[PDB]
Short mmCIF file of C-alpha atoms and ligand atoms in Angstrom, two decimals:
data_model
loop_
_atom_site.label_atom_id
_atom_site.label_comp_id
_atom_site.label_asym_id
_atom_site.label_seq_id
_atom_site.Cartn_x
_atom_site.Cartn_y
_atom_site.Cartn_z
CA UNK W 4 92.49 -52.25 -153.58
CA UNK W 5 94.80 -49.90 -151.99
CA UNK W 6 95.03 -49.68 -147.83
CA UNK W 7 92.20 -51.55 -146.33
CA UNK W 8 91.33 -48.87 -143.19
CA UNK W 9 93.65 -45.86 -143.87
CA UNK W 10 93.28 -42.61 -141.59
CA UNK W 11 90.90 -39.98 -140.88
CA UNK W 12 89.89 -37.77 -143.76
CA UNK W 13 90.30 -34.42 -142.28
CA UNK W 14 93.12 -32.25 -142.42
CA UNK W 15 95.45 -29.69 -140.73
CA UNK W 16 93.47 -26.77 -142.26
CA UNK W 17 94.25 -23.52 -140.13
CA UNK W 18 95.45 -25.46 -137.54
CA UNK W 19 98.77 -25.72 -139.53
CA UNK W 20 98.80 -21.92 -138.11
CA UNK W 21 99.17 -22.97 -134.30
CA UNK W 22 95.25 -22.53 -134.03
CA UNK W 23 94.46 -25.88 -132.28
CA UNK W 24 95.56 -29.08 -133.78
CA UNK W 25 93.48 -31.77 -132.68
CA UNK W 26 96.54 -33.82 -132.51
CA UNK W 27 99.34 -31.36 -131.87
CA UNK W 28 102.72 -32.84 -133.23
CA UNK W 29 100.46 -36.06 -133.82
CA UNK W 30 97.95 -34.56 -136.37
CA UNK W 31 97.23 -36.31 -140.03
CA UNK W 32 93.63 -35.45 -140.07
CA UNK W 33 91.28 -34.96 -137.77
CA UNK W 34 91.34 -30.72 -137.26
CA UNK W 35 89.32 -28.11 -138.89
CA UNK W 36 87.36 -28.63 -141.69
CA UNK W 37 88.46 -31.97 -143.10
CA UNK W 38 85.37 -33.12 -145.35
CA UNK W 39 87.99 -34.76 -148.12
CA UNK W 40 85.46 -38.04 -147.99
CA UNK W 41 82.45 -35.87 -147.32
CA UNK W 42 82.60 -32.96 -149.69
CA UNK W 43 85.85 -33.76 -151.91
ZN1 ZN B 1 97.86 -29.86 -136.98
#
């Protein structure tokens, strides 16, 4: 069953670098890439 909603399913990719960070100090997913439930 796990978590019934759970977060995004992106990830701090090259944000992590100071690119951009689509949630700057506030970022668990949504940034770069992030395709874990799309791709992964
Ligand atoms: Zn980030």
């Amino acid at each position: 069953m796990t978590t019934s909603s759970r977060y995004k399913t992106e990830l701090c990719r090259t944000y992590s670098e100071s690119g951009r960070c689509r949630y700057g100090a506030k970022c668990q997913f949504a940034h770069g890439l992030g395709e874990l439930r799309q791709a992964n």
